[PDB]
């Protein structure tokens, strides 16, 4: 009854999409691997604080590997904070806002895709 | 012919739909406002830097404010680390993998969403 479930963190709309599956979830930091090896899996973690008096504080590290053994990793860091005033609406106005800047066509996910720079 | 251009940060699939509009580009960081005023407006930040021998990094800030003035904002910070030896596909793989990651039905969104923790 929790959300510490499997997903596809990749979704290449067929066989060749990238699933991570829960792994461990110690000192309030769920993570998820792909079934690659060690050196080969995908990694998501996401962790949640309310250290703050004002806020939530969500932690969420994906590492994308390049397959070769990795021959790289791709890290990304995300920190989104919430104030604990927020209700369940504006949270779900939040996740659109973090689904819209990563939009298949938008500025920032074109810039990141193409390799090209902001401008 | 950059990709300094508005687009749809909350898209609500009609007219309630909020558009950041490009605002300024100083210090190599990206500034896109909603027409709102200074204190009601979304804010999305972005930014990129080959800094380090191995790495692009770009920084993604996103400011979402509640209505009301606002009487809240909430803040994400995305930091993007591509190894420059990643071509094209792996950076569309890497944006599909931070699509994937904010996945409507996914576990992080869920827990976002609902107000809820990981696990």
Redesign the interface.
């Known amino acids: 009854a929790?959300?510490?479930?499997q997903?596809?963190?990749?979704?290449?709309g067929g066989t060749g999409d990238?699933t991570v599956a829960p792994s461990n979830?110690a000192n309030?930091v769920?993570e998820?691997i792909s079934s690659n090896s060690r050196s080969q899996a995908?990694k998501?973690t996401?962790?949640?604080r309310q250290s703050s008096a004002q806020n939530?504080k969500?932690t969420?590290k994906?590492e994308?590997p390049?397959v070769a053994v990795a021959?790289?990793?791709?890290?990304?860091?995300?920190?989104?904070?919430?104030?604990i005033?927020?209700?369940?609406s504006?949270?779900?106005?939040?996740?659109?806002?973090?689904?819209?800047?990563?939009?298949?066509?938008?500025?920032?996910?074109?810039?990141?895709?193409?390799?090209?720079?902001?401008?």
């Open positions: 929790s959300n510490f479930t997903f596809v963190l990749v979704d290449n990238v979830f309030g769920a998820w995908y998501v996401a962790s949640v939530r969500y969420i994906v994308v390049k021959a790289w990793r791709s890290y990304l860091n995300m920190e989104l904070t919430i104030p005033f927020a209700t369940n504006d949270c779900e106005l939040i996740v659109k806002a973090m689904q819209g800047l990563l939009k298949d066509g938008n500025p920032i996910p074109s810039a990141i895709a193409a390799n090209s720079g902001i401008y």
